[PDB]
């Protein structure tokens, strides 16, 4: 199932639209009793969507795999993982913080479902991660306490920067269905995809845009280096003020 | 869970499996996935207890994953994950009218496309960044190459499309403590547990000084966003000038 629990958490919350108009609290359940003893359930039968919690991420995965785009009284089904409600980004992490540590530190704010540290295709800490709370109230606190205060995790004072999680969708995307529903759209369609030939407006334009784009890049990278350099110096600055005062008392 | 005539045995369908016993053979492997239908392609480092198999379908591979990951097998628990796409690009500067379908249409031109998607926010509005997945790497190089060489346009509006290699991040496995390298620089960061620093201490002053450098950095970068935006709108009307009246001579 899932050893050492993390049962019936928001990561086991699935969503389902395109419910036919004749649906009960009970028929829903009957649809997902294959995958065991359900948790919190919600339906707005009016608007033909519903939510369900399963015991485990795995069950939720299988359910989803099994019940997506399958019929129920004419209607094909929309199974999706539900977007977590109590989720923060964290940044400025010591390369030496672990998923475990980050979870540990954050529990001081209320029960945690999960906490992860985002890693590169080389598995190196990217310096960001996610913290996922059970409830929202805990996430409120976290985000407040940490904006108001200075939360540190390791010896070297790296202050945690905590933001609300921005949630992107890269699975559904922008389907044609929804696209067409726009005026500018049909105009934008009229001229197909293409490489633009030297000689045309399109050309001299985009070559120039490209340049502006390249510039912006350098500009941005330049800023990052400045402020990088600033940040390293500030180390070498404060030292004097304080560290030296601890070599005077000693 | 399926759609007749949906291109099958894609990279979206490739599973990696670690922690196989060193006494594994091809034929043990294919039967572990016996229940998930007709096995596609297989590779195995028998010396390194790891391997890959393609299945028919995303939905299958999901279930296989959910089912087998962490399952015991002659001593070890298997690690089973989705294999990291090898033929994948980031694309940016999308008119928010471009769609998954289009993006696919547009890039097929380079080679067969496993999948093309536009990344949409919570409001379902395009963010102008999107992903393109090819069957093969050639397809992805050729598509990067032309597109850095040339200028590639999608729509009547000449928004030129930028292509990068797709930077692949892990938010699943993450960085477990086990994996944290118990080098010196390790326990020595841990010597001091989590805490809020107190007003007056060094930890504090440093950290608030840092914070300010941080928010500065922010603003400065938003500023560059602002600068260039304007330059880009100036360029727009500029060009509309140098030409629409060449178009007025063509009227
Ligand atoms: Mg009831
Ligand atoms: Mg009830
Ligand atoms: Mg505890
Ligand atoms: Mg930075
Ligand atoms: Mg420890």
UniProtKB/Swiss-Prot annotation, chain A:
Give GO cellular component annotations, separated by semicolons.
Answer: chromatin; cytosol; dendrite; nuclear matrix; nuclear speck; nucleoplasm; nucleus; paraspeckles
Functional note: DNA- and RNA binding protein, involved in several nuclear processes. Essential pre-mRNA splicing factor required early in spliceosome formation and for splicing catalytic step II, probably as a heteromer with NONO. Binds to pre-mRNA in spliceosome C complex, and specifically binds to intronic polypyrimidine tracts. Involved in regulation of signal-induced alternative splicing.
Subunit (UniProt): Heterodimer with NONO. Monomer and component of the SFPQ-NONO complex, which is probably a heterotetramer of two 52 kDa (NONO) and two 100 kDa (SFPQ) subunits. The coiled coil domain mediates interaction with NONO, and can also mediate formation of long, linear homooligomers (in vitro). SFPQ is a component of spliceosome and U5.4/6 snRNP complexes. Interacts with SNRPA/U1A. Component of a snRNP-free complex with SNRPA/U1A. Part of complex consisting of SFPQ, NONO and MATR3. Interacts with polypyrimidine tract-binding protein 1/PTB. Part of a complex consisting of SFPQ, NONO and NR5A1.
Single GO MF descriptor: protein homodimerization activity
Q: Which residues carry this modification: N6-acetyllysine?
A: 34, 53, 136, 187
Residues with N6,N6-dimethyllysine modification: 29
Enumerate the subcellular locations listed in this protein's record, separating them with semicolons: Nucleus speckle; Nucleus matrix; Cytoplasm
Q: How is it modified after translation?
A: The N-terminus is blocked.
Q: Which residues carry this modification: Phosphothreonine?
A: 83
Q: Which organism is it from?
A: Homo sapiens (Human)
Q: Which keywords describe this protein according to UniProt?
A: Acetylation, Activator, Biological rhythms, Chromosomal rearrangement, Coiled coil, Cytoplasm, DNA damage, DNA recombination, DNA repair, DNA-binding, Immunity, Innate immunity, Isopeptide bond, Methylation, mRNA processing, mRNA splicing, Nucleus, Phosphoprotein, Repeat, Repressor, RNA-binding, Transcription, Transcription regulation, Ubl conjugation
Q: Where is the RRM domain?
A: 12-84, 86-167
| Boundaries of the shown chain within the full protein | 286 to 535 of 707
Query: What does the entry's domain section say?
Result: The coiled coil domain mediates interaction with NONO, and can also mediate formation of long, linear homooligomers (in vitro). The coiled coil domain is required for optimal DNA binding, and optimal transcription activation.
Q: Mark the residues carrying the PTM Phosphoserine.
A: 89, 94, 211
Name listed for the protein in its UniProt record: Splicing factor, proline- and glutamine-rich
Q: Which residues carry this modification: Phosphotyrosine?
A: 8
Q: Which disease is it linked to?
A: A chromosomal aberration involving SFPQ may be a cause of papillary renal cell carcinoma (PRCC). Translocation t(X;1)(p11.2;p34) with TFE3.
Gene Ontology terms describing biological process: activation of innate immune response; alternative mRNA splicing, via spliceosome; chromatin remodeling; chromosome organization; dendritic transport of messenger ribonucleoprotein complex; double-strand break repair via homologous recombination; innate immune response; mRNA processing
Give me the gene this protein comes from. Answer: SFPQ
Q: Where is this cross-link: Glycyl lysine isopeptide (Lys-Gly) (interchain with G-Cter in SUMO2)?
A: 53
Q: Where does this chain mainly localize?
A: nucleus
Q: Looking at the record's lineage, which domain of life comes first?
A: Eukaryota
């Amino acid at each position: 199932r899932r050893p050492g629990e993390k049962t019936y958490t928001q990561r086991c919350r699935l969503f389902v639209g395109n419910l036919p108009a004749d649906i009960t609290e009970d028929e829903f359940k009957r649809l997902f009793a294959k995958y065991g003893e359900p948790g919190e359930v919600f339906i707005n039968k009016g608007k033909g969507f519903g939510f369900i919690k399963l015991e485990s991420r795995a069950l939720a995965e299988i359910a989803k795999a099994e019940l997506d785009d399958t019929p129920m009284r004419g209607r094909q089904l929309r199974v999706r993982f539900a977007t977590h409600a109590a989720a923060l980004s964290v940044r400025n992490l010591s390369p030496y913080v672990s998923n475990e540590l980050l979870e540990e530190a954050f529990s001081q704010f209320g029960p945690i479902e999960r906490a992860v540290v985002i890693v590169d295709d080389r598995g190196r800490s990217t310096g960001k991660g996610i913290v996922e709370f059970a409830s929202k109230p805990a996430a409120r606190k976290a985000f407040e306490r940490c904006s108001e205060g200075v939360f540190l995790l390791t010896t070297t004072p790296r202050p945690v920067i905590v933001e609300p999680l921005e949630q992107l969708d890269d699975e559904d995307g922008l389907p044609e269905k929804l696209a067409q529903k726009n005026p500018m759209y049909q105009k934008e369609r009229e001229t197909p995809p293409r490489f633009a030939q030297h000689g045309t407006f399109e050309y001299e334009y985009s070559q120039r845009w490209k340049s502006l784009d390249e510039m912006e890049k350098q500009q941005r990278e330049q800023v990052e280096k400045n402020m990088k350099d600033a940040k390293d110096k500030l180390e070498s600055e404060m030292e004097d003020a304080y560290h030296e005062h601890q070599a005077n008392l000693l």
